[PDB]
Structure formats: C-alpha cells, structure tokens
Amino acid sequence: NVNHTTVTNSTPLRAACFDGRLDIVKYLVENNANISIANKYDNTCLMIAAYKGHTDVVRYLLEQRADPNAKAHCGATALHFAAEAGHIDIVKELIKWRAAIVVNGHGMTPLKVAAESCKADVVELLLSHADCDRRSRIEALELLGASFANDRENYDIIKTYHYLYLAMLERFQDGDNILEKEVLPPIHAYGNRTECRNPQ
Amino acid sequence: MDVFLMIRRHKTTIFTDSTVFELKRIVEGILKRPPDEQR
Amino acid sequence: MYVKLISSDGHEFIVKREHALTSGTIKAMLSGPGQFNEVNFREIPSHVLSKVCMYFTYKVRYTNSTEIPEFPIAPEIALELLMAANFL
Amino acid sequence: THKDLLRFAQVFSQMIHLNDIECVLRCSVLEIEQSMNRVKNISDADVHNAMDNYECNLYTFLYLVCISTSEEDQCKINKQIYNLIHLDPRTREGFTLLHLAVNSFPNALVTKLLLDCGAEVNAVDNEGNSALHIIVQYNRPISDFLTLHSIIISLVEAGAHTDMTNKQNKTPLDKSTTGVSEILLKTQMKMSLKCLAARAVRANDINYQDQIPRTLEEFVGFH
Ligand SMILES: [Zn+2]
C-alpha cells in the first residue's frame, strides 16, 4: 500500500507493475489506483508504463482512459520517451489515440531523437501521423544518413550516400523553391573540404 | 542566351535560335546574301 | 555544317545539325550509296514538318529533373502524325 | 514427398542458418515438377496437390538459389533453372515467378537472376496487372531504400513500358500513392514523339477504325 512503502513517493502498485502479474489487473488495477507520484526527474505513471516493456497493463491503462499528457524534468511525454525505448508497438498505440507533441527545448523534436539514435523505422511511422511543414521533411532525412557515417552499433558506408540522394532531389521538385545550403568557410580541423550543394 | 528565333523568309524558313546586322550576317551565313539586302 | 530538309509539298526547311543525330532514319539516309546534303522526304505533307521540327527542338529544350511542361498537343493532326512517327 | 520433400528442403534451410548438391536437390523435381504439371493437365482438381507446390517450387529457388547467389557448375545451375524457359506454368490469376517475386519475397538476387535467365518482362496478367504496377505500391518505403532501387533499376533495363494502361485508365505512375516511389520512377524514363501522339489519339473519341497498319495497332491499344 502507498502508506506501507518507501519514503520517496513510491507506490506498491508501481512496484507490482515491475513484476507484471495478472493479479495486479485482477485486484488493484481493476479497483482504485494510485492517482499521481513524482520523483527527482519528475516520473509519472504514464512514463513508467511506457518504459516497462510489458504493454498489456500499459494498453489496459489507455483502456482505462489513460491521460495522454504528462511531464518530466524536461519536456518529454512518450514521444521523447518511446523514441529511445524502441518499443514500436506502444509508439503505434500512442499514435492510435491521435496524440500530439511540441518540441523539447532541452532536447530536440521527437522526430529528431531517432536521427542520432541510428534507429530508422521509427521515422517513417512518426512521419505517417506527421502533418507538419514539408520543410521539416527535407532536414529530417539528411541527419539519419549522416549519423550512419560515424557511429558504433551499425556502420554501413553505402546507405549514407543513398540516404542523401533522395534528400537533395526532394529539394529540386519544388519549382524554383530551392532551400539552398548556406555554409561557413571550411574549418581546417574538419579537413579542408566544403559542404556540397550542387546535385552532382 | 534565350535564343529562339521563329525565322520565316519568303517561301524559306530558318529555325535559327547578336546585333540586327549580325542577324543579317547569319542570313548571309546561310542565304549568302548582302546583310543590308537581308536587313 | 547545318542541314536542310526538302519538303515534298514544296516548302523545304533549314535546321540545325544537332537534330540530325536525334532521329530514326535521317542518319540512315544521310550516309550510304547516296551522300558519301539535302534530301526530299516525299512521304509527308509540309505542315507536319512544322510540328516535327518543333518536337526536334523541344528535345534540347529540356535535357538532363522533376518539373517539365507539356509539349504543344496536336489537336486534330495526330491521326496523320502517328502514321509519320513510325516512318522516321 | 508432397510434404516430405519440402521437409528435407526445410532441413537444408535449417543447416543454412544452423551453419552439385543444389543441382541434385533440384533434380528431385527435374521431371517431378513436370509430372505435377502433367497431373494438373490430366484433371483440373489436381491443382490441389499443387497450390503451394507452385510456391514451394519457387520457394526452393527462394533458398537454393539464395545460397547459390565453379563457373561450369554455375552454368549447370543455369541449365537447371532453364527448365521453365518456355514450359511456363500459368498460375492462378496469371502471376508468374517474377510477378509473385515482386509482391511481398521482396528479394533482389532472386528477381535479378530470373530476369537474367530470361522471362516475359512485359507479361500481362488477369485484370491487366503489370510487373511495374505491383512494385510501386509498397508499405515500407523508408525502411529499405536499397531494395526498391535495385528492383526498379533492374526492371526498366530489361524493357517495360512506363506509360502502360490497365483495363481502366490507371498508369503505373497513377496507381502509385506512396510519396517516394513516384520520384524514383520519374527520375528514369525516356520519351518519344510517338507515345505523346498515340496517347491523345486513344484519348480522343475519334477511333482509328482499322485505317492504321496492323503492326501499329498494338502501340495504341496498349496505350
Ligand atoms: Zn509508351
């Protein structure tokens, strides 16, 4: 019980959610549940549910009209938080409820998280529910390939060039609306070449 | 630059893509006629 | 170093030699037992040659992405333009 | 061996991930695949021993050729796949080996070799389906950009019309609804004065009414 628990705003309902037994759904989740808790980085139930790889209780939470909004120490609620989690199923679950999000100033846009994560499939799913500016599409595809050039988990030189060709050709179909690539003079530390702007 | 001349002479046609005199010069380059004559 | 076609109906035309290469049989009958440089294609009306040359020039009008406008569509001469496309 | 042969093939697939041979395993259906066809000829209901055995046929080359992907033995393997060079089994709905290969399986090495050996590039199925008509509609565009590239590039080199029409007026470009396949198509075709002229003639209510040469009729009916 929340009275018989640790000091720092814990709840044995959440501790049971670690186990994930069906007895929780039978007795506690079905009955009244812990309303709200917080911690140092401002954890809420909607976050720890997504973080838990078990999703039947998380889905059941939505089945219980789970609140689609929450906060943490930074501006993250499940689009900045399911991004690095990699659990595509709950990403689709949250898209199912047509939830939205704004940028996180401390971090980046939820789309941009997967760009530096080297993960890819997430972008297409996110773009599906994305009805934002087309200008975002141009710059959201040149960073996914760029990360593959110098990373650790998955290194493949061939995909890097391929993923930038679509990127440039999506900027010349706009009918003399070329959003050119303004560049600073080359830095001697990073070689001596210059960022490319012509198609060839 | 942007050269696109729909030239149409008397029963003669030049699809040639320069001063007006140079145009007559091109006419001389083809019809081989005096530029003033092909004013 | 420019070429000139001869019209069977009586009104031949002078054109650039860049188009001479871009063709089906012009290269064929500009070389051989003849012409080792004007040929009368006697198999066509004169007005068709206007659109033929317009397309010929349109070839270089849009060479090497994305946006390209439409070539001037033949409203009522296409029935004879088709029988001409295969010939050359 | 209706399912037992597929079982040993499964056994071979096992050691594949478990970490002349291929010619001999194919020699299993060398004529058997043809006796399959003969029994289908004998009775129409005999395609029931065969519904998956067309698939399990092309499933084999989905794996035995997959591992296949000496030069004399490789020419032998080409002879082995040369069995249905003209013995083309008309499957249900007219989907050939290429036609099921393109539909998603979604492979490039199998699809390139089946084209390399030789097949009907512009084969038309029931309801006017074309090989390029299927590839454009794909549900995982951004997931793999290195496979659609290979398939689209390989298909056009063999020769297929990019201005084809279905039974109803639906060009392969028109049927494509994905945002990327349109660009990776539009950046490769050639154009001719012939197609641009015939397209309007077919579009116009004016009919040729057999006033054109017969050899020119299937450059207009197709369009
Ligand atoms: Zn065509």
Curated annotation (Swiss-Prot), chain A:
Zn(2+) 1 binds at H73. It is found in: Cytoplasm; Nucleus. Its main location: cytoplasm. The keyword Metal-binding applies. Zn(2+) binds at C74. ANK repeats lie at residues 8-37, 41-70, 74-103, 106-136. GO terms for biological process: apoptotic process; branching involved in prostate gland morphogenesis; epithelial cell maturation involved in prostate gland development; proteasome-mediated ubiquitin-dependent protein catabolic process; protein ubiquitination; regulation of DNA damage checkpoint; regulation of extrinsic apoptotic signaling pathway via death domain receptors; regulation of ubiquitin-protein transferase activity. Zn(2+) 2 binds at C74, H106. Keywords: ANK repeat, Apoptosis, Cytoplasm, Metal-binding, Nucleus, Repeat, TPR repeat, Ubl conjugation pathway, Zinc. Widely expressed. Highly expressed in testis. Weakly expressed in other tissues. GO terms for molecular function: death receptor binding; metal ion binding; ubiquitin-like ligase-substrate adaptor activity. One of its GO terms (cellular component) is ubiquitin ligase complex. Component of a CRL2 E3 ubiquitin-protein ligase complex, also named ECS (Elongin BC-CUL2/5-SOCS-box protein) complex, composed of CUL2, Elongin BC (ELOB and ELOC), RBX1 and substrate-specific adapter FEM1B. Homooligomer. Interacts with PPM1F and PHTF1. Interacts with the death domain of FAS/TNFRSF6 and TNFRSF1A. Interacts with CHEK1. Interacts with NKX3-1. Belongs to the fem-1 family. Substrate-recognition component of a Cul2-RING (CRL2) E3 ubiquitin-protein ligase complex of the DesCEND (destruction via C-end degrons) pathway, which recognizes a C-degron located at the extreme C terminus of target proteins, leading to their ubiquitination and degradation. The C-degron recognized by the DesCEND pathway is usually a motif of less than ten residues and can be present in full-length proteins, truncated proteins or proteolytically cleaved forms. This is Protein fem-1 homolog B. The gene is FEM1B.
UniProtKB/Swiss-Prot annotation, chain B:
It is found in: Nucleus. Belongs to the Elongin B family. Heterotrimer of an A (ELOA, ELOA2 or ELOA3P), ELOB and ELOC subunit. The elongin BC complex interacts with EPOP; leading to recruit the elongin BC complex to Polycomb group (PcG) target genes, thereby restricting excessive activity of the PRC2/EED-EZH2 complex. (Microbial infection) Following infection by HIV-1 virus, component of a cullin-5-RING E3 ubiquitin-protein ligase complex (ECS complex) hijacked by the HIV-1 Vif protein. The gene is ELOB. This is Elongin-B. SIII, also known as elongin, is a general transcription elongation factor that increases the RNA polymerase II transcription elongation past template-encoded arresting sites. Subunit A is transcriptionally active and its transcription activity is strongly enhanced by binding to the dimeric complex of the SIII regulatory subunits B and C (elongin BC complex). Core component of multiple cullin-2 and cullin-5-RING E3 ubiquitin-protein ligase complexes (ECS complexes), which mediate the ubiquitination of target proteins. By binding to BC-box motifs it seems to link target recruitment subunits, like VHL and members of the SOCS box family, to Cullin/RBX1 modules that activate E2 ubiquitination enzymes. Component the von Hippel-Lindau ubiquitination complex CBC(VHL). The modification N-acetylmethionine is found at M1.
Swiss-Prot record, chain C:
It is found in: Nucleus. The keyword Glycosyltransferase does not apply. Pathway: Protein modification; protein ubiquitination. GO terms for biological process: protein ubiquitination; regulation of transcription by RNA polymerase II; target-directed miRNA degradation; transcription initiation at RNA polymerase II promoter; ubiquitin-dependent protein catabolic process. The keyword Iron does not apply. GO terms for molecular function: protein-macromolecule adaptor activity; transcription corepressor binding. GO terms for cellular component: Cul2-RING ubiquitin ligase complex; Cul5-RING ubiquitin ligase complex; cytosol; elongin complex; nucleoplasm. SIII, also known as elongin, is a general transcription elongation factor that increases the RNA polymerase II transcription elongation past template-encoded arresting sites. Subunit A is transcriptionally active and its transcription activity is strongly enhanced by binding to the dimeric complex of the SIII regulatory subunits B and C (elongin BC complex). Core component of multiple cullin-RING-based ECS (ElonginB/C-CUL2/5-SOCS-box protein) E3 ubiquitin-protein ligase complexes, which mediate the ubiquitination of target proteins. By binding to BC-box motifs it seems to link target recruitment subunits, like VHL and members of the SOCS box family, to Cullin/RBX1 modules that activate E2 ubiquitination enzymes. Component the von Hippel-Lindau ubiquitination complex CBC(VHL). Heterotrimer of an A (ELOA, ELOA2 or ELOA3P), ELOB and ELOC subunit. The elongin BC complex interacts with EPOP; leading to recruit the elongin BC complex to Polycomb group (PcG) target genes, thereby restricting excessive activity of the PRC2/EED-EZH2 complex. This is Elongin-C. The gene is ELOC. The chain holds residues 17 to 110 of 112 of the full protein.
